[PDB]
Every structure is written in structure tokens, then in C-alpha cells.
Design an enzyme around this catalytic site. Structure first.
Site, mmCIF file in Angstrom:
data_model
loop_
_atom_site.group_PDB
_atom_site.id
_atom_site.type_symbol
_atom_site.label_atom_id
_atom_site.label_comp_id
_atom_site.label_asym_id
_atom_site.label_seq_id
_atom_site.Cartn_x
_atom_site.Cartn_y
_atom_site.Cartn_z
ATOM 1 N N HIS A 163 1.186 1.397 -5.329
ATOM 2 C CA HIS A 163 0.031 0.417 -5.934
ATOM 3 C C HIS A 163 -1.263 2.175 -6.176
ATOM 4 O O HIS A 163 -2.509 1.842 -6.723
ATOM 5 C CB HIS A 163 -0.692 0.328 -4.522
ATOM 6 C CG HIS A 163 -1.839 -0.168 -4.224
ATOM 7 N ND1 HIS A 163 -2.576 -1.236 -4.836
ATOM 8 C CD2 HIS A 163 -2.725 0.787 -3.457
ATOM 9 C CE1 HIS A 163 -3.363 -1.418 -4.490
ATOM 10 N NE2 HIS A 163 -3.970 -0.372 -3.517
ATOM 11 N N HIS A 203 1.008 -1.226 0.306
ATOM 12 C CA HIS A 203 0.037 0.074 0.166
ATOM 13 C C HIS A 203 1.302 0.931 -0.089
ATOM 14 O O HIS A 203 1.445 2.106 0.957
ATOM 15 C CB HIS A 203 -1.060 -0.484 1.325
ATOM 16 C CG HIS A 203 -1.970 -0.724 1.492
ATOM 17 N ND1 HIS A 203 -1.448 -2.029 1.524
ATOM 18 C CD2 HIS A 203 -3.254 -1.418 1.038
ATOM 19 C CE1 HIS A 203 -2.280 -3.216 1.485
ATOM 20 N NE2 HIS A 203 -3.819 -2.249 1.111
HETATM 21 MG MG LIG Z 1 -6.198 -0.611 -1.483
HETATM 22 MG MG LIG Z 2 -6.715 -0.622 1.417
#
Ligand SMILES: [Mg+2]
Ligand SMILES: [Mg+2]
Ligand SMILES: *B([O])(=O)C1=[C]C([N]C(=O)C2=NC3=C([C]=[C]C(O[C])=[C]3)C(O[C])=[C]2)=[C]C(C(=O)N([C])[C]C2=[C][C]=[C][C]=[C]2)=[C]1
Ligand SMILES: [Mg+2]
Ligand SMILES: [Mg+2]
Lengths: 354, 355
Positions: A76, A72
Site C-alpha cells: 500500500h 496497510h
Molecule cells: Mg493509507
Molecule cells: Mg492510513
């Protein structure tokens, strides 16, 4: 450099990791640069008279809020942003066009014929800009832990949000708090109170849909409106129906991994399991039961990928394709559907044989 | 010991004169919520069922009641009144309600007269009823005296923090539980295991969050679909979600019990809530914001406010709760006290409006 990057992103399997290697020392600004190119491509900069300085100021601050964690992160967020942009601008077979109230049209592709349609021709520009901006915020300040981890630990964030969509609420809340933190970030200054309030609402709704605990709820709602044999499908004049389309779209983008070539799929898989293992290390250090698939000793990678593709990604893409919203080419060939089934087959082989 | 019987006999009336109690307490009126919580938990037996130590119980709920501000409506007295209302609605006999009995409570202040009567305490487990009571105690903790619309329009820190979705209710639950976890001298649930405590916190949070009036008609629709269906059998008491919905509707009714009381208490609570409204309207006018309806002290429109509130909010909720056969009353036909109060007040205010 703008033409170079926009041509590389026109491919669904955009080699984003090649881009991070190409940027190198300035790789921390990938999210801001991709935001600028996409808004210039869709024309959102001129449609809403968005000043470039405040635009860049906020999103450089935004990407700074993403931590240096395996999954994350900024890459991403950049990938999800690219996915929603591709899914909404590219031609979709058999879809009707409406307006192609402001609407966008991507300079990177035109509908080959009338048999093709674009989501940009059916969803207003204000709603699509919310989806893109929400994709930029959707994982802001992610601590590398799961919602279940925070609730089990009784972390301050989990107590603050009463265990209801802890990470997703924090992402939207801290992103908008950052937006209102300084006047040099107000790039929406040419939107009125009603338009800005609605924009914030659409962004928040789009971000909160990324919670996978509500996954099956969203899937049920989407099939009732679009994939009903006795109903008239999606009414594009309806505000709530368009919101449901956008929420399902960003849900598919946040887990697009298996719907790409195996190369990108495995790279994203490597990242997320590394984040899982860091959480499992902390769970073990705190004397907590290690969450499933989070012990680096017993990985069970094949079972993880197989269940995730079959129970989460599989039904979502099949529902999105049955509704006739996936971009492709005329039988009909869908690129990410072919990628999804190919990846699912390989992981089933790894599971059955090992 | 001597004051316990007096208070427990005074609270058995649906029109409990709580303001006479605050006047009797006087200097120590700030501890009314804690005293009533202790009295109700001793009456229902929740102290012995869950082995709740008295010291931590009193410490935590004294801190809780201290967290309520000195504002006209959303205060210690309102929370105490909602707690009394949920206690009465869950313990008192209901005509035609079935009895069933996992621990369950029974109020020492009343026994079911016969088998034709039933108590919610006999159909809802003790843990869920204790969650409902504690949630009633927390449901307006640290209320700043403003509406959700005021906070979202102002972009208040709380409104941005909770993304405009049930700002005040989320804040109530979050800060109340943060207070509970703030010190070990507050952990009076120390004899609940991980599963029971997690479930208790979940039930408390759901009950607190149900008090949002923006979700009012959604809860009303779900309750009419589940309970008030002519072709359905009403509520299945073995279902966890059905009991949760019953408790949510109960606390929603308790949070707005005013019009279903005698005119004295109804008008006192009306005075409080309209004073809070007028303060918010003063602040809105100072900030150059459009004054929310019924919040301008220059044009009060008190009759229109009462009539619209009774017809659009309290009315349908009470009618749904009564059609499901969950309101305490007595046989005759059935006579329900708060239904009589509600219809009387509705007639009075309709007369005030039309004339
Ligand atoms: Mg996500
Ligand atoms: Mg998330
Ligand atoms: B808190 O949070 O709890 C609140 C409250 C309220 N309330 C009101 O309004 C009222 N109340 C009452 C009355 C009477 C009596 C009584 O007793 C109890 C009570 C009245 O009269 C008139 C009234 C409310 C709230 C809210 O929410 N708001 C104000 C907002 C809204 C409006 C409309 C609709 C919905 C919502 C709170
Ligand atoms: Mg409240
Ligand atoms: Mg209240």
C-alpha cells in the site's frame, strides 16, 4: 534492472502485485527499491546530494516497520508513493510551466508540447521530496485497526494522542523517531537546519492530511482556492497554496483504488475488507458492537464500495480535475477519471440489482 | 467544616491571596490543588449532581497535583489559580448577561442580585463547566519548565512524539488522562455513562489544548467573529460549539490572568515565570543555542516583556471577552474589576518602559 522497473511504473495502472510476485523471496524490500528508482529518476539523489547508503539503510528499516496485515502494508505504501510520483511528474493539459530554488524533471517523460505542463515545474524540489517521503511513511506501523476502534477501546495510542488523528500522528512520529534513531539513516545530511526543519514540517503535514475525518475539511479548502470562479485560482508562489496542493494530491493517492483498472481496484478492495473483518472479529470477541462493514457474515460489499466512491473518492477526483491538475491527453481524456466512473457504474449496478 | 467557610469566603475575592494560603498550609502546601478542587466542587454542587464519591475524587486529584513539578511558574499553585479564575468567571454575576435555566450548577457563594444580572453557570450545562474546571486542574500537568520552541529546537522526545504540534499541551492532557485510567481507585466519574464520559473527555481535551499560545490569535479571531460581530447576535447558548468556544476563551483568559489582578499577585507570578525563563535560558546557553527572547538573565528587559505581553497577548483577549459582555462586573456604565486592574498595570508598565 532499473530501466525495466521504471518503464513498468510509467503506466498509471502499474501492475504492482505482479512486481511483488516477481520479487518473491525478497518482496519485503519493494518499498526501498521503488524509492531508489524514483529518486534517481527525478534526480533527487543528485539535487540534494543524498548518499545512497544512508538512504537505503533508513527505508529498509522503514519498510520493516510495516506489518504483515491485509491492506496497510508495504505494498500500500509503495502504491501511494507511485501515485504521488505519477501525478506530480506527468504532463497535465493546459497547465502552465514555471521553471521547466531547485525543481525536478522526470527522465521517464517530457512534456509533449507547450500546451502541456508538469507539477514538477511549479512545485520546488524540496516540497516534492517531502511528499514522496511522506508517502513512504504515511502508514508506518499500522496495527490494522481504525482510529474509532482505538478511541472506543481507549488504547494507549489513542490516549497518548488525545483521540486526535491517532494513527496518522503515530505514523509520522514513529517514522521520524526511527530516522533520528541512528546516524546511519541521516541521508539529508546536506540540508541545513532551516531546510531540514521545513522538510520535516512538510512531511508531517502531508502525512496528517491522510486522515479521512479531516477529508471534507481539506476538500472545502481546496475548492475555495483553486475552484473559485471569482478568485485567481492557485498562486504557485504561495507556500500555503502549494502545501494545500500537495495535501490534496496525497489524499487522492491514498485512495487511488477506484481510479485504476477494475483489476487493481478489486485487489485493493479485497485487502481492505480482510483488514476490516479482522477488526470485526476482535470487536466481537471483546463484546463490542461490530463496526459497519466489518462483519464477514453480512459483508455489504456493494454498499461499501458505492458509498466510498460516491462520497469520498468521487468529489475528490472531480475537484482535482476541475482545478486542471490531473494528467491526461487532449475535449480532454483523463485516464483515472474514466476508470473512476467505470468502477462507480459497475458497483451501482451490483447495488441496484442485488 | 470550620475551615470550609473560611476558605470559601477567602476565594470569593477576585484577587484571591493564594500565596497567603500556601503560606498558611506550609508543610501540607502540596495538597492545595486537591483542597481547592474539593471546596469548589462542594460549593458548585458538582459532587451531588454527578454523585461523585469523595474517596476516588480526592485520590485522583492528589495524584494529579503530585504530578506537578517543583518549578517556579508551571506548578500546583498555577493550576489552582487557573481553576479559581475559571470558577469565578463562570459563577459570578455578569451585567446584561441573559439567564436561561440537562443539569446546571449555581454557586452557593453568590446569587444573582436581580434579573439584569446573569451567570455563565445559568447558561452553560453543568457537565461542560465541570469539564472546564477539571481541564484547568490538568492544563499544565507534568510541565518540564521549557517552551514548545525549546523542545522542537532540541528535538526532545516529547516534540518528536507529538510532531511539534502543541507538544506540552498534548502531553498535559494525555498524561493526565493516563493517570486517571491508571487505577480503578481514581474513577470518580463512574456514574457517567459511555456517552457522557466520552463527551466529558472530549471537552476536557479541547479546553486543555486551547491553552496553547501559538493558537492564541486564531482563537481570538474566531471569538471576535462569533461574539464580537456588530451585525451578529453574539453567542447562541444553545449551540454546542459556541459554548465550547466560550469555555476555551475563558480558560485562555484564566491561564494569563496575572496582569488583570492587583499588582501584588501580578508581580509574584511575573517573578515565577521569569525565573522559569531564566532557567531555560541557562540551559540554552549551556547547549550553545540562541537564547530565547526575555530569557537571558544578563539582559532581562522586564519592562519590555511585561508591556509586550500585556499589549499583544492579554490585552486583545480581555478586550474581546469584555466586548462580548461576559466579564463579571457591576452597573454604574459598567465597572469591571479585572479591566481596571489590567488598565492600571498596562499604564504602570508603559510608564516603566517609556521612562
Ligand atoms: Mg493509507
Ligand atoms: Mg492510513
Ligand atoms: B505555561 O504553559 O502556562 C506558559 C505560561 C506563559 N506565561 C507568560 O509568559 C507570562 N505569564 C504571566 C505573566 C504575568 C502574570 C501571570 O499571572 C498568571 C502570568 C507574564 O508577565 C510577563 C508572562 C507563557 C507560555 C508560553 O507559551 N511561552 C513563554 C511561549 C510564547 C512566547 C510568546 C508568545 C506565545 C508563546 C506558557
Ligand atoms: Mg500550559
Ligand atoms: Mg498554564
Amino acid at each position: 534492472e532499473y530501466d525495466s522497473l521504471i518503464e513498468k511504473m510509467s503506466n498509471w495502472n502499474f501492475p504492482i502485485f505482479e512486481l511483488v510476485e516477481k520479487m518473491g523471496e525478497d518482496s519485503g524490500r519493494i518499498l526501498s527499491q521503488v524509492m531508489y528508482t524514483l529518486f534517481q529518476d527525478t534526480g533527487l539523489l543528485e539535487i540534494f546530494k543524498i548518499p545512497t547508503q544512508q538512504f537505503m539503510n533508513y527505508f529498509r528499516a522503514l519498510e520493516n516497520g510495516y506489518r504483515d496485515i491485509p491492506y496497510h502494508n508495504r505494498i500500500h505504501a509503495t502504491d501511494v508513493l507511485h501515485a504521488v510520483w505519477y501525478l506530480t511528474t506527468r504532463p497535465v493539459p493546459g497547465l502552465q510551466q514555471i521553471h521547466n530554488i531547485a525543481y525536478i524533471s522526470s527522465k521517464s517523460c517530457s512534456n509533449p508540447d507547450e500546451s502541456y505542463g508538469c507539477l514538477s515545474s511549479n512545485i520546488p524540489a524540496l516540497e516534492l521530496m517531502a511528499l514522496y517521503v511522506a508517502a513512504a511513511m504515511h502508514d508506518y506501523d499500522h496495527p490494522g485497526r481504525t482510529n474509532e476502534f482505538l478511541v472506543a477501546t481507549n488504547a494507549p495510542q489513542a490516549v497518548l494522542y488525545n483521540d486526535r488523528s491517532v494513527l496518522e500522528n503515530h505514523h509520522a512520529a514513529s517514522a521520524w523517531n526511527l530516522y533520528l534513531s541512528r546516524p546511519e539513516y541521516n541521508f539529508l545530511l546536506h540540508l541545513d537546519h532551516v531546510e531540514f526543519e521545513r522538510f520535516r514540517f512538510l512531511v508531517i503535514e502531508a502525512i496528517l492530511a491522510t486522515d479521512l475525518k479531516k477529508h471534507f475539511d481539506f476538500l472545502a479548502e481546496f475548492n475555495a482556492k483553486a475552484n473559485d470562479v471569482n478568485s485567481n485560482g492557485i498562486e504557485w508562489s504561495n507556500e500555503n497554496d502549494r502545501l494545500l496542493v500537495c495535501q490534496v494530491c496525497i489524499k487522492l493517492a491514498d485512495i487511488n483504488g477506484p481510479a485504476k483498472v477494475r483489476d487493481l481496484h478489486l485487489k485493493w478492495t479485497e485487502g481492505i475488507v480482510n483488514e476490516f473483518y479482522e477488526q470485526g472479529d476482535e470487536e466481537a470477541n471483546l463484546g463490542l458492537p461490530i463496526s459497519p462493514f466489518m462483519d464477514r457474515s453480512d459483508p455489504q460489499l456493494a454498499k461499501l464500495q458505492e458509498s466510498f466512491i460516491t462520497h469520498i473518492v468521487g468529489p475528490l477526483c472531480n475537484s482535482y480535475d476541475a482545478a486542471g491538475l490531473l494528467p491526461g491527453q487532449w475535449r480532454i481524456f483523463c485516464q483515472l477519471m474514466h476508470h473512476l466512473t467505470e468502477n462507480h457504474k459497475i458497483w451501482k449496478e451490483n447495488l441496484y440489482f442485488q
